[PDB]
Scaffold this active site. Structure first.
Site, PDB file in Angstrom:
ATOM      1  N   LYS A  70       0.869  -1.408   0.042  1.00  0.00           N
ATOM      2  CA  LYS A  70      -0.136  -0.073  -0.065  1.00  0.00           C
ATOM      3  C   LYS A  70       0.740   1.382  -0.046  1.00  0.00           C
ATOM      4  CE  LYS A  70      -2.518  -0.797   3.797  1.00  0.00           C
ATOM      5  NZ  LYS A  70      -1.799  -2.078   3.919  1.00  0.00           N
ATOM      6  N   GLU A 108       0.649   5.705   9.956  1.00  0.00           N
ATOM      7  CA  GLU A 108       1.935   4.810   9.001  1.00  0.00           C
ATOM      8  C   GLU A 108       3.255   4.678   9.728  1.00  0.00           C
ATOM      9  N   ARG A 109       4.216   4.353   9.071  1.00  0.00           N
ATOM     10  CA  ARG A 109       5.479   3.965   9.521  1.00  0.00           C
ATOM     11  C   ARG A 109       6.472   5.424   8.934  1.00  0.00           C
ATOM     12  NH1 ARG A 109       4.314  -1.366   7.134  1.00  0.00           N
ATOM     13  NH2 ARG A 109       4.041   0.129   5.288  1.00  0.00           N
TER      14      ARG A 109
END
Ligand SMILES: Nc1ncnc2c1ncn2[C@@H]1O[C@H](COP(=O)(O)OP(=O)(O)OP(=O)(O)O)[C@@H](O)[C@H]1O
Ligand SMILES: [Mg+2]
Lengths: 47, 514, 464, 464, 49
Positions: free
Chosen positions: D159, D185-186
């Site tokens: 994604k 998110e990261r």
């Protein structure tokens, strides 16, 4: 003739495997329902 | 323009008078996540409409000895502890009248399309009794959806409750919008015994999707007899819960006045989700999938308003087309099971069939209509009698498609007939077919006139043939429409025109069809 | 003395009574909704005692419009239903209110719907077959007098025609009656059944008790008990054999589950109420034969997810003595009553309850029909001519047998005029013994359609 | 008239105020943590009024170090974020504090993160195709300019890679303003995006708001709203076409679930909060585009347990016009961008919008792929040799089509080494028409893997 | 967390660290036990949110 016999055996085995997998899928369906209700009512009891 | 810009206000100022009536007040003691608890209001009644200071509205839904837990209908962030809550002495009610045709209204009956106000003829409580057993009548009049598959295999008779059930992006809203569009021919007749008034209830859809549906209806001419009761996802859980009841009330007003109504709930799954959210926020005990105990009742209480009334009550009918999204085609889930139990029949739409190109994607066989032939005109009943058996035989024979040389003559003929019937039931979107055209189309296939056309051309051969018949041999269509049966002389004329057309038809493969 | 509503959470209503006047469990209490649009008299069924003189009740009617502090009056007795010859020919709800003629039966004898099953010493120790007169039922899946029969089917498989047929046969052959317990009726289906029975003129022999779907789960749960109480009155007081239909007893289970959830009880295995087996037992154990009279019941059963191991069907089938399965395939072949001889079953088709000749003939018929069902694929794909001579003989015999399982039902008399046939069990046994031995393989297949017994077979053969 | 902390439970803090000063819901309150190692000003958001002049708040920064009884001062307004052209080219957190330049926008115009969605009167459907250059997206899931787009997927199916590729394909040449909301998110990929945008000179036209997963539930809830506020300012107050990338929008609902039980809500199915649908609907509806004011929003959606039946992705599906749906099954087979061609869909893929040729080719590709999916069960056991000749040819077609839907994307250079490629929509339609019609059945299937175009197909076939 | 803190002290001094958490599934179980003993209502699979 051997193809007839082998395919009849294959159809019977496929039907038995369908029955076994359907019994299984019913078991996991019931188990998922139970587990979901256990989680929901565990949250309910704590709140 | 006019003096009204002032005059209206004058009429208000001359007519306005805020009199001093006694009122029972509660105070908001809790407020969170769309639920407000109101201490006081001793005489409040269940499902009453409370009004909060900022013009906000709520529904007294839990009544205890301590507080009244009310679900707030939008603008929840404006509710605070200590606010004064006044009770309106009215249970949930919505305005109803013919002014709702062509309007988009929120579950309280207030317009949201930006046009003028709606002149309400009357008000109806959302929780009025459904017609009783003694007050109903047998479902016997067709409600032509315009979809060959539904009208031939699982007919919907006005007064019925047919469930369009299937996974996401399978063609449900398409089926219901097509059904709404197909009623334009009936509407233009001007005969109330034929006119069908539509109520598209959107629950949990995004605003742009409701706008898209409204555009599809307007470009199809259906907006002059359709109301859209919209509870977009932006709206509170209360609106998503109430929208089906709002739409059902607007339809019921017409139904008890002799009109015929067509109610589309899209979807009832989101109705159930909103009710679950409200119930869990009010701390009502949960059950399977966390739904409250009465979720079935929520849907039943709704769908059982959809009835055909006896001639003593005007003979009006309200047809339900609830739409349910089944996750991973699991029709055994809780809400799908409940509504399959409630409804009179099911159009099961499957994504596998959709991808195979079987769109509108009704899984015939699994799909059923308990009203049956009583909901079909005699022409379709006789023409489409053999269609179901033919399709069942085709699905049985599909495994033999590669060995047609080794099958019996009858079996190979059945396979060839079934492939062409499957191609025949396919239909483009936003293009419903009048019942006469459906009769002729199914006549082509069931009577074997497609057996010479190639499969890949059947869709075209039908489309052109009707386009020919309409333009040149409309006597067939007029006969089917006016008499409701396919007479023998009309059948012979139809066969002759089919054969004449066959000679002039160019198959896509270059072969001749005769 | 009168209680006051102190909580209203959907169908659940809590009532506070004076300390000395708390109603006992399952009592029916009356509350008044005075709001004009929703004016009503709620019947609340006491379900729990919460303490401090509070009782938690399940409202049998929608509680919208109910107000806190409204007077609640205790009737002193549980939900009572009218019982008598007067209930025949009329439709009632779970609470005994007549739907087609309001105010009817309010002056009849009223019976509480909560009645214990027969004493253990009063039960019949020996299963007795119910000779209903239908060839297919009496031969392949004999019904049990005082037993329960599952009725699998749907729309367009003649379930309603079979219900009419069994109503006629119980009313005429056994001199009994019928009570149709419409648990979870679709109001449309209920109205259709009412008009069909009135037109067939069998309404006078049946008492309808509809708990519609639009009502809260209390009535859907109590309607089976109400209809069974009418059946019990017919059995014990009038001394009539009764036929209690229950369409659909899964609904009853699901209404129990919803009531359990509403009261706050922790759900069992698959979300069903913890007392599922006990509710189902308390319902089914009352359907039994006592003192020479019996309540038979044809109970349509829904199997969730087509899973017979699910708690609801698993509990239901612990009580079902026979299983009649109507088939679309058989119905399309003109073979009314549309019973599938292979899918249907009975637990009395044993050499002991039925005669050894009966069991032998039934097993031979089942064998022939199964062999034919196996050969159907070859016939449909390869054609009839690809079979062997022994296979073709068996196919002809099976065609004739399965067509002879059809019968001119009494319910069809209204359509054709031909009186329905009541084939004696012995005649059916000997006729099918003749069929399976090939004694009638030379008659045309059309001779076997819709005919009761060998006399009718011979007459129809001579008429062709 | 300041408040006082009474009860601290993880991210949830209860504050008692004087009676006349209870803050409104969604108001921002400031506590202070004075412990040296964790000293900070802690921003709470009033989430519930709980009575007795208590309010329950969701903390934006970690509550580690907060002390009961500490003064809590009410800001009198909801959390406000800076807006304007100043935000472009800078990195902000959920609270509107700039990261790459602390104290930068403190003097800009400040807008509340909470605002009602645009009125239904101002919404019109969007039906203009957005050519991304990805074969699979352009063919089977055409994106809508001004519409809502999603990249569903399991965990670690690509994604972030695909959303970065879409930033590379849509924003690099975009004339308007971009907003990237990194919602839980990261952080590594956030920094990678920051440096990538800086190197390509797109940063000057992009505003980044990060609420990455190191942060507590409050930020992972309100960061999407903080970025959507900037997007809405650009939409309304300036009329510039806006791109709104969000990664990952599921973290919003997941943070709501994380604080759900501490707020006293009874959990719904699968442990989600009861307000899942409404909470996500408000945010999603704020993202729509109003007539004459376009927001082209792309939302990476995370599917828990790879289960597309999970309530969060299932509810999010209703909010999207185009939905690419990455699957681990396709990712395992080496296909990158890992799109499931069958599960993915787009509302603009109608013959009236994309044209009859594009629609026909897309529907034929989907038909072939569905037939291949149905046959894969047979092939794995009975073997390909036992299929029909037509089905065998179709299988050979479908393998090549699946591999041709793979593409070497620019953002995946570090996944494959080779540079990215862009395929015009016309070339995609032509190539897939040729495939589905057979012009490439003679080429080896590995020639279709990670090529992106007909010229690349020919070159790789020659190299094979 | 103790391992991560020990590693982070080195990390912020310009040194490269390699942390191995063997296994994080058992940390999740431990946190579940702690949460349920503190009587925090659980989420899915009885785990805390
Ligand atoms: N008969 C049809 N022929 C061709 N395309 C169709 C047909 N029916 C539907 N479609 C297309 O299929 C897609 C899904 O249609 P639709 O919006 O009606 O689905 P739905 O089942 O209501 O799903 P959703 O949950 O997204 O509302 C749309 O692209 C629609 O154009
Ligand atoms: Mg839809």
């Amino acid at each position: 003739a051997s193809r007839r016999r082998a395919m009849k055996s294959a159809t019977d085995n496929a039907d038995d495997l369908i029955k076994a997998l359907t019994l299984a899928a019913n078991r996991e369906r019931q188990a998922q329902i139970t587990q979901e209700i256990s989680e929901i009512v565990g949250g309910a009891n704590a709140l | 323009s006019a003096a009204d810009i002032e005059g209206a206000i004058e009429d208000y100022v001359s007519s306005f008078s805020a009199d001093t009536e006694r009122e029972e007040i509660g105070t908001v003691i809790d407020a969170g996540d769309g639920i407000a608890h109101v201490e006081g209001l001793p005489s409040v009644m269940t499902q009453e409409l409370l009004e909060f200071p900022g013009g906000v509205l709520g529904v007294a839904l839990n009544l205890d000895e301590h507080s009244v837990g009310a679900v707030i209908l939008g603008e929840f962030e404006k509710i605070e502890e200590g606010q004064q809550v006044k009770r309106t002495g009215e249970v949930l009610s919505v305005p109803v009248g013919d002014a709702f045709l062509g309007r988009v209204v929120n579950p309280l009956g207030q317009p949201i399309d930006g046009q003028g106000d709606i002149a309400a003829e009357t008000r109806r409580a959302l929780e009025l009794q459904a017609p009783s057993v003694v007050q109903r009548q047998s479902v016997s009049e067709p409600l032509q959806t315009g979809i060959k598959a539904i009208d031939a295999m699982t007919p919907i008779g006005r007064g019925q409750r047919q469930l369009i059930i299937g996974d996401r992006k399978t063609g449900k809203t398409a089926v219901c919008v097509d059904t709404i569009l197909n009623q334009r021919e009936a509407w233009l007749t001007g005969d109330p015994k034929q006119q069908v008034r539509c109520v598209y209830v959107a629950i949990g859809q995004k605003g742009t999707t409701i706008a898209s549906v409204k555009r599809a209806l307007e470009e199809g001419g259906a907006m002059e007899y359709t109301t859209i009761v919209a509870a977009p996802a932006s709206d509170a859980a209360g609106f998503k819960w109430l929208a089906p009841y709002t739409g059902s009330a607007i339809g019921q007003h017409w139904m008890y006045n002799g009109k015929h109504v067509l109610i589309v709930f899209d979807d009832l799954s989101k109705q159930a989700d909103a009710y679950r959210a409200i119930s869990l926020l009010l701390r009502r005990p949960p059950g399977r999938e966390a739904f409250p105990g009465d979720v079935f009742y929520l849907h039943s209480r709704l769908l059982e308003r959809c009835a055909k009334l006896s001639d003593e009550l005007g003979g009006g009918s309200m047809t339900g087309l609830p739409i349910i999204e089944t996750k991973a085609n699991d029709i055994s889930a809780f809400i799908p099971t409940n509504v399959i139990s409630i409804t009179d029949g099911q159009c099961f739409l499957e994504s596998d069939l959709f991808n195979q190109g079987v769109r509108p994607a009704i899984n015939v066989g699994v799909s059923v209509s308990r009203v049956g032939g009583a909901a079909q005109i005699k022409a379709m009943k006789e023409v489409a009698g053999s269609l179901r058996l033919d399709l069942s035989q085709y699905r049985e024979l599909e495994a033999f498609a590669a060995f047609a040389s080794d099958l019996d003559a009858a079996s190979k003929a059945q396979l060839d007939r079934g492939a062409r019937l499957v191609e025949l039931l396919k239909q483009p979107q936003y293009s419903p077919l009048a019942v006469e055209e459906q009769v002729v189309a199914i006549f082509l296939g069931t009577q074997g006139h497609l057996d010479s056309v190639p499969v890949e051309d059947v869709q075209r051969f039908e489309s052109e043939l009707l386009e020919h018949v309409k333009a040149s041999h409309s006597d067939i269509f007029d006969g089917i429409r006016e008499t409701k049966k396919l007479s023998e002389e009309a059948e012979e004329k139809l066969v002759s025109v089919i054969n004449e057309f066959k000679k002039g038809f160019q198959a896509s493969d270059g072969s001749s069809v005769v | 003395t009168a209680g006051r509503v102190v909580r209203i959470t959907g169908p659940v209503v809590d009532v506070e009574f004076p300390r000395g006047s708390v109603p006992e469990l399952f009592n029916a209490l009356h509350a008044e909704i005075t709001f004009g649009a929703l004016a009503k008299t709620l019947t609340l069924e006491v379900a729990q005692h919460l303490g401090d003189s509070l009782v938690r009740c399940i409202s049998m009617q929608p509680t919208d419009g109910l107000v806190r502090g409204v007077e609640v009056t205790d009737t002193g007795a549980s939900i009572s239903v009218p019982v008598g010859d007067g209930v025949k020919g009329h439709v009632f709800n779970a609470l005994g209110d007549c739907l087609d003629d309001p105010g009817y039966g309010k002056d009849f004898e009223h019976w509480s719907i909560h009645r214990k099953p027969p004493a253990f010493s009063d039960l019949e120790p020996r299963t007795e077959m119910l000779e209903t007169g239908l060839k297919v039922v009496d031969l392949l899946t004999p019904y049990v007098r005082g037993g329960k029969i599952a009725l699998f089917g749907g729309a367009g498989v003649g379930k309603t025609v079979l219900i009419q047929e069994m109503i006629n046969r119980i009313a005429r052959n056994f001199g009994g009656t019928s009570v149709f317990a419409g648990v979870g009726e679709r109001t449309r289906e209920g109205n259709d059944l009412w008009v069909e029975l009135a037109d067939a003129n069998v309404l006078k022999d049946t008492a309808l008790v509809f708990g519609q779907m639009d009502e809260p789960p209390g009535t859907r749960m109590r309607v089976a008990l109400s209809a069974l109480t009418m059946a019990e009155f017919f059995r014990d007081e009038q001394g009539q054999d009764v036929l209690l239909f229950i369409d659909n007893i899964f609904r009853f289970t699901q209404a129990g589950s919803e009531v359990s959830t509403l009261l706050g009880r922790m759900p069992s295995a698959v979300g069903y109420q913890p007392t599922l087996a006990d509710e189902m037992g308390e319902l089914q154990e009352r359907i039994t034969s006592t003192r020479g009279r019996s309540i038979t019941s044809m109970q349509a059963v829904y199997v969730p997810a087509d899973d017979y191991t699910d708690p609801a069907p698993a509990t239901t089938f612990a009580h079902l003595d026979a299983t009649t399965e109507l088939s679309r395939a058989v119905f399309s072949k003109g073979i009314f009553p549309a019973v599938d001889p292979l899918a249907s079953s009975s637990t009395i088709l044993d050499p002991a309850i039925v005669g050894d000749e009966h069991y032998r003939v039934a097993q031979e018929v089942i064998r022939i029909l199964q062999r034919y069902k196996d050969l159907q694929d070859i016939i449909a794909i390869l054609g009839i001519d690809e079979l062997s001579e022994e296979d073709k003989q068996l196919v002809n015999r099976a065609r004739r047998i399965e067509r002879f399982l059809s019968q001119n039902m009494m319910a069809a008399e209204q359509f054709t005029g031909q009186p329905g046939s009541t084939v004696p069990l012995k005649e059916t046994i000997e006729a099918f013994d003749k069929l399976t031995k090939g004694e009638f393989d030379h008659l045309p297949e059309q001779a076997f359609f819709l005919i009761g017994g060998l006399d009718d077979l011979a007459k129809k053969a001579e008429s062709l």
